[PDB]
Write a protein that binds this ligand. Structure first.
Ligand SMILES: CCCSc1cccc(OC)c1NC(=O)N1CCC[C@H](C(N)=O)C1
Ligand SMILES: [Zn+2]
Length: 138
């Protein structure tokens, strides 16, 4: 679990959005596993506007932050799960690092701010949904 709170927006993994997120929907994209909902209070986060490929992410299954080198946002095949059919997920960045089901929503940050959130993983990999191209969040 986890979310980004910026301005009057809450960014979450689309597959973990709540009834409240859908009732206050701003934008969603199943191909990116992202959903943004509106909030009444001002958020705590700021968004990176950069091309960093190194950063640090929070891994809830280890209660720890890990440094990572991650690929540029791209279209990557993601196998079927209880949440989605087998498909290509766009704007996804992969890295070698631990992750397991439950780690989605953990934030990835570089020196400039929030880069994205954990969205996929497996066998020593962790995938992050990029949010740096969503300029309207600011
Ligand atoms: C219960 C799923 C076990 S596979 C796994 C194994 C290790 C880490 C994992 O995520 C952090 C995952 N989970 C996973 O990749 N997805 C399941 C939820 C929806 C994700 C998506 N964006 O399509 C894909
Ligand atoms: Zn950066």
């Amino acid at each position: 679990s986890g979310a980004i709170y910026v301005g009057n927006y809450r960014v979450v993994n689309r597959h973990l959005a709540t009834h409240n997120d859908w009732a206050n929907l701003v934008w969603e994209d199943s191909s990116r596993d992202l959903l943004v909902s509106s909030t009444t209070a001002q958020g705590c986060d700021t968004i990176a506007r950069c091309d960093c490929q190194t950063g640090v992410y929070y891994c809830s299954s280890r209660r720890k932050h890990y440094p990572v080198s991650f690929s540029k946002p791209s279209l990557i095949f993601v196998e079927a799960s209880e949440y989605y059919p087998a498909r290509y997920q766009s704007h996804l960045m992969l890295a070698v690092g631990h992750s397991e089901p439950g780690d989605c929503g953990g934030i990835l940050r570089c020196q400039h701010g929030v880069v994205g959130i954990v969205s996929t993983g497996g066998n020593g990999l962790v995938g992050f949904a990029d949010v740096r191209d969503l300029l309207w969040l600011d």
